[PDB]
């Protein structure tokens, strides 16, 4: 269902200030090259990892932003010391913030909400599908561990997982473990996901699960780096899905 923003003269795209609970804290929208204010918009956030900001995430959201068309509002948030600890919940509140406002003032479709990001950004997509469950449709962490904690973690969500088998800074293990908690809450059948050998392409396995919420792991033969050409491809389709 849509939105009370929906048909309402919509602000303009760029960076954004909010006050989450007395915190100052900033983040980008980046509407639509047509913004039709009467359409329900896929919501995308991009989460950036440690040491970067919502400037290296926007203007591209992780190749999501060549291929959404028109179809998706983004956002890239900023971390607090350049990373999402996400103390005691403090970063899922924030979200939670930028949530009420920018479904306030935009056309956005509630069923379509989603959330990526690479590692420190991917873990927080993770705490976002923990806690978050009931608002994302969808995660899916580029390189991603559970850095910035889970709380909750036991409804289902659909989940994608990207990892470089040769990442020596997140080892592919963690992702597989982000995995393994969505095979468990989605009622996943298990299923061997092999491997890409070094050299070879990635290899995509896409699990039987409850078809409200599938479960697909992409790993790729190379390491701590989300900028592989299938990854903003495979985001994308797997969010349009829906
Ligand atoms: C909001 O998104 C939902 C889910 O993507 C849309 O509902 C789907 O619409 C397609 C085609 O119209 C159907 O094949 C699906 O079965 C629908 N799914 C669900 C869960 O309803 C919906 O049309 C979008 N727009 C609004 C206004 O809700
Ligand atoms: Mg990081
Ligand atoms: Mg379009």
Redesign the pocket.
Do not use: M
């Given at each position: 269902?849509?939105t009370a923003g929906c048909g309402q003269n919509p602000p303009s795209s760029g960076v954004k200030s909010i006050n989450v609970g007395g915190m100052n804290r900033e983040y980008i929208l980046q509407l639509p090259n047509n913004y039709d204010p009467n359409k329900?918009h896929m919501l995308i956030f991009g989460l950036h990892w440690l040491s970067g900001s919502m400037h290296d995430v926007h203007p591209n959201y992780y190749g999501l932003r060549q291929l959404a068309g028109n179809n998706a509002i983004f956002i890239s948030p900023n971390g607090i010391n350049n990373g999402w600890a996400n103390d005691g919940g403090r970063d899922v509140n924030f979200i939670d913030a930028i949530l009420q406002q920018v479904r306030s003032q935009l056309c956005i479709?509630?069923?379509?909400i989603f959330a990526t990001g690479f590692s420190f950004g991917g873990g927080m997509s993770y705490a976002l599908g923990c806690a978050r469950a009931n608002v994302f449709?969808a995660i899916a962490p580029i390189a991603g561990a559970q850095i910035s904690g889970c709380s909750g973690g036991t409804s289902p969500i659909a989940f994608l997982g990207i990892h470089g088998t040769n990442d020596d800074v997140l080892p592919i293990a963690m992702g597989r473990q982000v995995r393994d908690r969505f095979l468990q809450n989605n009622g996943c059948q298990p299923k061997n996901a092999p491997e890409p050998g070094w050299g070879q392409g990635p290899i995509k396995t896409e699990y039987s699960c409850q078809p409200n919420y599938p479960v697909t792991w992409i790993a790729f033969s190379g390491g701590h780096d989300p900028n592989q050409s299938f990854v903003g491809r495979e985001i994308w389709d797997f969010f349009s899905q829906?």
């Open positions: 269902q849509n329900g479709n509630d069923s379509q449709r829906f």
